Design a protein around this ligand. Structure first.
Ligand SMILES: CCCCCCCCCCCCO[C@@H]1O[C@H](CO)[C@@H](O[C@H]2O[C@H](CO)[C@@H](O)[C@H](O)[C@H]2O)[C@H](O)[C@H]1O
Ligand SMILES: CN(C)c1ccc(O)c2c1C[C@H]1C[C@H]3[C@H](N(C)C)C(O)=C(C(N)=O)C(=O)[C@@]3(O)C(O)=C1C2=O
Lengths: 1033, 156, 144, 48, 48, 48
């Protein structure tokens, strides 16, 4: 193939041009996102039951739905929460690789068929079935700055005049409103009702009758009487459109003929559908849109399209309305693309400089400069064809591959130059001879790199999905790299390189290059002298090697592992958790403190605080909230003190003082699934008839035991909520029957007033919206208020609620959990420092084995994806190991010579570990992929040394030592050239601070540590490996 | 409310005896009450923590404290079948006939849940067999409505 | 034929008929399944101490085993050889007539007195200012 | 009585069924026992 | 049934359409709402 | 129809480029290829 194209440079160019066009096209059309999809497909079922307590939700909705989730394919597990905000979410998680659309339609269809078993008011609200996603493209805040709009006003404005246009925008896949459209709010007064012998029942009845769409028919409809001249639709009653009209609704006509209207027993207003969340943006009322990127969409284009749509809405905003961007991943993603493009370009520039420093002619210099971009472009085309996107992982994949790509370019060109100087052969003939020397090794190297990286595509679950991104990217690059090396670069060498006179090693040149050459020629002799001395004394080097292997193991076992580095993404989170039972106003006070802190103490760092009162992550309620902090641009936050990690630490220390509340700040995880931490995710399960209280006792028992092993387990805690005081009211059936008061009147009077009730729909400026009745606040606050509500008995007498009821305080759950259809309690924890999650999980199972009869357990989430796809790693690198050996055996036509290459593995790993350990980094994904590329490149260096050595012995009858010294003499320059270019190129990454530097450090540090020790050690140890392996056989 | 009072409400609820011990040594308010009027003694009664019930009483807890709906620790212990706690409370002067706001007594509650031993103890301590709640019901009315024959026989 | 799509297409048409079906039929749950007609296996359950009747074992199986088996991927249909327990009210026409009652009253009373009520909260949102109490109101719950 | 979903693998499904039953056994009431009266699976595995 | 064109558009057509976002490969969408109360929404997809 | 018309120039341009490259590769020349491609207007004008 090299021979073919050396005679056919135009054909070689044509292949190169085709590759470049394909890659160029791919670059134009490739999707862009921060991260690809990684988490297994999940489907969420969400339902709302206005005024319902957790047990009601669970026992009239959740259990019923769960019991119908049968006959659905590829389900891994299912879980649910039912809580006292009247909410249920059921999450079903599917095997990786499941078609999410199919998963979701199978779920929706089993649900549709369970709907008739659900309560009416739940069928009324609807039950949503959705694909799950935890990642937003951006969050658009919408605020009013002139004090003229409430959050409800704003949410409705957004809903009516912005949301649909954003949803229709190019590239957006989904939009969530942070609030609701208006609802017609009827706030009832029990004193007024009783005054006119009315109840909420009469209010609901009247609304249903006087706010309705009534079908009529047609004038002259078919069949007609013949001769009919007119056909026209009849329009009869249609829905009410205004608060005025709801106010005028007729409830009663008194004996004196005077009229009781709805506005006589209630305050009427456009309001929100719910009042659990109070949102503020720097203290001002706020709403917003949470936007997600559509499948295959380009993040940067979409964010741009979103901003353009918003801009064209701006002219029509009411006064004080303002758009705000508290969260947008696009600027961060832009940085990553610029940084990766910068890295690749200056890598090419570094290769240019190194080539000129050593080869000292611009023609040799130009060949890598052409070959490398051809390889990169082609890789993009292959990725595109594979369905990959440009993302953080795939971009760093190509960075991690730079050394490997550059090496193929340098090796082909450097060898032609050597052969010319060493033999005087003209460029064409030299190039043929040179490719004859490295051809098979180049292919062998491609096979070995394949055997290293491909198996990594076969890890399961989420970490597998991540590994696959690096694996396929790097293997594709290597494939292109060897194709360009066998096709284009030989053609370029044979046609672009000037001849070199035999024996001309440039030592006669003047100035610097003249001084460099004699210097490097002497250094080579020094080098080969040492190798000669080393090879006279190989025993001690076997000892040194074992010391390295031992030290590698020592450092490896102590390096803490992680997933992905935190980043300063310009935002972070503050959790606000008040004691159980704390009211919304108390939580607001604390958020007010939190906000006042950030806008004072972090004045120079913080752009905005988006305070969400009433929202939590592991349970909503009045006593919880979050403060989402957005920072100024990285450029205005110079220094480590003004980066997220430091701001966060200061915040948390500052808030540790706050009185009766847990308040702390934290950076955002790179993904969010994957659970980071050490982290295990454990489910305690009621397997028998046990009930919530016995399950809780068993949970407490488990937690107390776990706490007795600080050596192994840390922060073993429930993920859910503790029981709280609740108000139990008993209706006395007998007294109600004796008074002629129907239970239905009693129960809707109670529920409507104290819980709210969705009556029907109305039309507000052309948009359909809900109508809610509920008591005005001051009549549903306290137990004494219960007695102010009256119900009409059959005989017309008004009967106070206190006549037929009794009440007591008790405890109950504000949030009931289930797992695979059984009562459950989720427990989070982590392995203690130094301990493996596997060890921690084993203990948890041991402790779990001693719990009361009927109590079982399971592993879910990140832990579910350890109990399987972690018992899988060793067999993959066993396969890698075997396949690498088999390729080398075929390359060298020897069962033993392969060992002399494989022995290089620890030489680079030691440097990677030393560097990571020293800098205080962790064994994470970038570290690990870097190990593989460092191993790969050192293996490629070794392969060519052994190859040269072995052929000198086979074809020139040279002795073992003689061949080894000559081999190692010829390979020194290309080995140093590649390592120099690469190490310089990956250096900016190591020192980088600011946006994306967490990832950049993880990539750079390990690669640079490893390449330094791999290079410095292997040029001495590989001669040793080859000699000792050859002697032994 | 106080700092240590809150901690005591929580420890009594959780049945952390040793923490209660320490808290008692430091003067944590045995008369602290949460927003519904439950004292540490209410909590320990409700959740069946006998040793904490006894410790709390040694440390001056109001044995007849009532919550915002008039219920006492004896109501709770009797309702949830904690026999030993019922006995201890009574030994320490619990009002065997306390009426909550509904006119409900410890005897009513124990009858309703069919706690027979507890009913006998309450009777032994002078529980008024003829006490009527707001609906005119007695412990005996409750037993026949529940169809509890053993209980009905005990109440004559 | 893709059995997934066949099932989706059948159900899309079924939901058009669903509202036209008797309420008692809808409440029994109509099901759409894609499975072989023959049994893969039969899992039997017995009690070797003889401490459980046929009825007991059947309820145990329905209530603790069948749902998880039914959700297992590849399980197309599961038939219970027995029946889950229900609350059985066995009416006596003689006593009904004696008290001038019918099964209609019995049905109404059961719906009224075996109910699970949504009753809201004390101190619920939106609240008055200075509210200090927040607690769920618990009314009637299902009988057990 | 369990029927195989259209196109699903009979041996894999039987394995998943046994795995699931295994999760339940430890919590059986006393005397409860699973028996295996009828299985078309064994013959497939054995004949192969 | 019985609804006029505008009523059915406000209570049905617009409600469905604003939920027809982020569907793969959608080229365009057209609908009509009429005096018999009937709605038809047609979504046309890219050729492949 | 609009789509058809809009993409046609792209179609012709990439087709001509591909044809040219195939020739260059087949005949190891840039000149032979340029010589034959000049023929294209001779045929296109007749079609028009
Ligand atoms: C691009 C990276 C460049 C890094 C260069 C930095 C210095 C690296 C030094 C590498 C070690 C070479 O060290 C080499 O050791 C051997 C012994 O093992 C010495 O060899 C000498 O001692 C041995 C043992 O007593 C004798 O058998 C041998 O005959 C004698 O010449 C070499 O004279 C020395 O050169
Ligand atoms: C959790 N989240 C991002 C926010 C942030 C700021 C907000 O101002 C809000 C939310 C959640 C949303 C959910 C919506 C929901 N829906 C989309 C209409 C909803 O079902 C409820 C509900 N309690 O049932 C809301 O609280 C809700 O009305 C609401 O008020 C929200 C809201 O105000």
């Amino acid at each position: 193939m090299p021979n073919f194209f050396i005679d056919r440079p135009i054909f070689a160019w044509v292949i190169a041009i085709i590759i470049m066009l394909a890659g160029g096209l791919a670059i134009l059309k490739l999707p862009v996102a921060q991260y690809p999809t990684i988490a297994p497909p999940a489907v969420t079922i969400s339902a709302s039951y206005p005024g319902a307590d957790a047990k009601t939700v669970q026992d009239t909705v959740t259990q019923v739905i769960e019991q119908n989730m049968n006959g659905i394919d590829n389900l891994m597990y299912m879980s649910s929460n039912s809580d006292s905000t009247g909410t249920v979410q059921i999450t079903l998680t599917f095997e990786s690789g499941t078609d999410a659309d199919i998963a979701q339609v199978q779920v929706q269809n089993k649900l549709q068929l369970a709907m008739p078993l659900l309560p009416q008011e739940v069928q009324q609200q609807g039950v949503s079935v959705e694909k799950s996603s935890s990642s937003f493209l951006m969050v658009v805040g919408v605020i009013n700055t002139d004090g003229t709009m409430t959050q409800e006003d704003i949410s409705d404005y957004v809903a009516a005049n912005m949301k649909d246009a954003i949803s229709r925008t190019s590239g957006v896949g989904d939009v969530q409103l942070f609030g609701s459209q208006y609802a017609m709010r009827i706030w009832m007064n029990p004193n007024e009702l009783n005054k006119f012998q009315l109840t909420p029942v009469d209010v609901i009845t009247a609304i249903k009758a006087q706010n309705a769409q009534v079908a009529a028919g047609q004038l002259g409809g078919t069949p007609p009487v013949k001769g009919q001249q007119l056909n026209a639709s009849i329009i009869a009653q249609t829905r009410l459109t205004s608060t005025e009209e709801f106010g005028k609704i007729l409830l009663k006509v008194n004996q004196d003929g005077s009229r009781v209207l709805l506005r006589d027993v209630a305050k009427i207003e456009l309001g929100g559908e719910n009042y659990d969340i109070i949102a503020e943006f720097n203290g001002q009322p706020a709403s917003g849109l949470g936007i997600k990127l559509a499948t295959g969409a380009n993040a940067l284009d979409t964010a741009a399209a979103i901003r353009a749509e918003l801009a064209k809405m701006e002219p029509f905003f009411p006064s004080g309305l303002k758009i705000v961007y508290p969260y947008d991943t696009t600027p961060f993603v832009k940085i990553s693309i610029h940084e990766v493009v910068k890295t690749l370009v200056e890598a090419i520039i570094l290769v240019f400089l190194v080539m000129y420093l050593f080869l000292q002619n611009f023609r040799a210099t130009l060949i890598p400069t052409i070959a490398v971009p051809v390889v990169l472009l082609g890789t993009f085309a292959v990725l595109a064809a594979f369905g990959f996107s440009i993302n953080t992982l795939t971009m760093f994949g190509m960075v991690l591959a730079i050394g490997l790509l550059v090496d193929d370019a340098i090796v082909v060109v450097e060898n032609v130059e050597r052969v010319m100087a060493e033999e005087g052969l003209p460029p064409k003939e030299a190039t043929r001879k040179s490719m004859g020397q490295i051809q098979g090794a180049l292919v062998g190297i491609a096979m070995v790199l394949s055997a290293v990286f491909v198996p990594m595509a076969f890890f399961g679950g989420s970490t597998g999905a991540i590994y696959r991104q690096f694996s396929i990217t790097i293997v594709s690059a290597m494939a292109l790299s060897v194709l360009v090396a066998l096709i284009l670069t030989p053609a370029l060498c044979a046609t672009m390189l000037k001849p070199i006179a035999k024996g001309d090693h440039g030592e006669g040149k003047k100035g610097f290059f003249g001084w460099f050459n004699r210097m490097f020629e002497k250094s080579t002799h020094h080098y080969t002298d040492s190798v000669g001395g080393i090879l006279r004394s190989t025993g001690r080097y076997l000892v040194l090697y074992l010391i390295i292997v031992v030290g590698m193991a020592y450092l490896f076992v102590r390096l803490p592992s992680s997933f992905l580095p935190d980043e300063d993404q310009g935002v972070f989170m503050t959790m606000v958790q008040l004691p159980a039972g704390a009211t919304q106003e108390r939580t607001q006070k604390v958020l007010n403190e939190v906000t006042h802190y950030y806008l004072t103490k972090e004045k120079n760092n913080v752009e905005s605080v988006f305070a969400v009162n009433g929202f939590g992550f592991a349970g909503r309620g009045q006593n919880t909230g979050i403060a989402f902090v957005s920072l100024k641009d990285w450029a205005d936050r110079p220094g480590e003190e003004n980066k997220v990690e430091a701001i966060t630490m200061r915040a948390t220390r500052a808030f540790s003082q706050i009185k009766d509340a847990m308040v702390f700040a934290f950076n955002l995880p790179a993904i969010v699934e994957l659970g980071t931490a050490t982290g295990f995710d454990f489910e305690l399960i009621d397997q028998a008839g046990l009930g919530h209280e016995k399950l809780t006792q068993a949970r407490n028992q488990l937690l107390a035991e776990a706490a007795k092993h600080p050596d192994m387990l840390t922060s073993v805690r429930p993920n859910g909520l503790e029981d709280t005081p609740q108000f139990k009211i008993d209706i006395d059936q007998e007294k109600a029957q004796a008074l002629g008061v129907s239970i239905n009147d009693i129960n809707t009077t109670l529920g409507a007033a104290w819980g709210g009730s969705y009556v029907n729909d109305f039309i507000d400026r052309g948009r359909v919206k809900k109508v809610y009745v509920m008591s005005e606040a001051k009549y549903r606050m306290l137990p004494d208020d219960i007695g102010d509500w009256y119900v009409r008995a059959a005989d017309g007498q008004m009967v106070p609620f206190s006549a037929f009821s009794s009440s007591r305080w008790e405890y109950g759950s504000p949030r009931l959990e289930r797992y695979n259809g059984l009562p459950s309690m989720e427990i989070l924890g982590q392995a203690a420092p130094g301990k493996s999650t596997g060890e921690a999980m084993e203990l948890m199972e041991q402790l779990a084995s001693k719990l009361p009869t009927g109590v079982g357990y399971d592993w879910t989430g990140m832990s579910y994806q350890e109990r399987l796809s972690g018992n899988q790693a060793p067999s993959l690198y066993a396969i890698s190991l075997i396949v690498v050996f088999l390729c080398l055996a075929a390359l060298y036509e020897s069962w033993s010579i392969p060992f002399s290459v494989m022995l290089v593995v620890p030489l680079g790993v030691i440097g990677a570990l030393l560097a990571a350990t020293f800098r205080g980094l962790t064994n994470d994904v970038y570290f690990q992929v870097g190990l593989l590329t460092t191993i790969g490149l050192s293996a490629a260096n070794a392969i060519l040394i052994v190859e040269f050595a072995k052929d000198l012995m086979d074809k020139e009858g040279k002795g073992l030592i003689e061949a080894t010294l000559d081999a190692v003499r010829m390979r020194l320059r290309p080995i140093l050239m590649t390592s120099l270019a690469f190490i310089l190129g990956v250096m900016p990454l190591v020192i980088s601070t600011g946006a994306g530097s967490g990832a950049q450090n993880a990539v750079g540090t390990g690669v640079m540590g490893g390449m330094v020790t791999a290079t410095v050690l292997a040029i001495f140890f590989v001669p040793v490996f080859f000699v000792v392996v050859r002697r032994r056989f | 409310g106080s700092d240590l009072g809150k901690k005591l409400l929580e420890a009594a609820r959780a049945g952390r005896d040793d923490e209660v011990r320490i808290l008692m040594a430091n003067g944590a308010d045995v008369n602290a009450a949460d927003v519904v009027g439950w004292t540490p003694l209410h909590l320990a009664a409700y959740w069946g923590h006998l040793e904490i019930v006894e410790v709390l009483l040694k440390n001056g807890a109001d044995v007849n404290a009532y919550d915002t709906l008039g219920s006492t620790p004896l109501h709770l212990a009797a309702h949830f079948g904690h026999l030993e706690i019922v006995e201890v409370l009574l030994k320490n002067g619990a009002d065997v006939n306390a009426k909550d706001d509904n006119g409900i007594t410890p005897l009513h509650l124990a009858a309703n849940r069919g706690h027979l031993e507890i009913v006998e103890v309450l009777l032994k301590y002078g529980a008024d067999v003829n006490a009527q709640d707001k609906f005119g019901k007695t412990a005996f009315d409750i037993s026949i409505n529940n169809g509890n024959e053993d209980l009905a026989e005990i109440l004559q």
